[PDB]
Structure 1
Amino acid sequence: LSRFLGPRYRELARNWIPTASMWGAVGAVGLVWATDWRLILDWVPYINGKF
């Protein structure tokens, strides 16, 4: 398919993949206190967040 074909489609997606960890890692930090992810609160020694 030549649906989304082109060197233009991955050129704006070339300069956005630095700020497309604002898509995935922001979801990874968007589920730290909304979820209480238990074994990745010891990602840091800093969060003794519940007593």
Structure 2
Amino acid sequence: LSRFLGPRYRELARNWIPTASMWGAVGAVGLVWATDWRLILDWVPYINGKF
């Protein structure tokens, strides 16, 4: 809504992008590991031995 945007909320976004992006990376790696996603995991040195 119009309550969002504005000056203040943009700095909040700036301070929370690092943590949110790293949480997204956490989720991506968790999905890859749990589902044993071949596509991503055929290029990581050690665990290529699974297949």
TM-score normalised by structure 1 residue count: 0.70
What's the offset of the Cα at 1:22? 2.1
Unmatched tracts of structure 1, length 5 or more: none
Unmatched tracts of structure 2, length 5 or more: none
Describe the SS at the equivalent of 2:37. coil
What's the offset of the Cα at 1:49? 5.3
> Number of aligned pairs?
51
Q: Deviations along 1:17-48, whole A, 9 cap, x unmatched?
A: 12222232111111122111012112311104
TM-score normalised by structure 2 residue count: 0.70
Shifted more, 40-49 versus 27-36: the winner is 40-49
Query: Higher helix proportion, which one?
Result: 2
User: C-alpha distance in 1, partners of 2:37/2:4?
Assistant: 38
Describe the SS at the equivalent of 2:41. coil
Corresponding residue number in structure 2 for 1:6:
6
Describe the SS at the equivalent of 1:33. helix
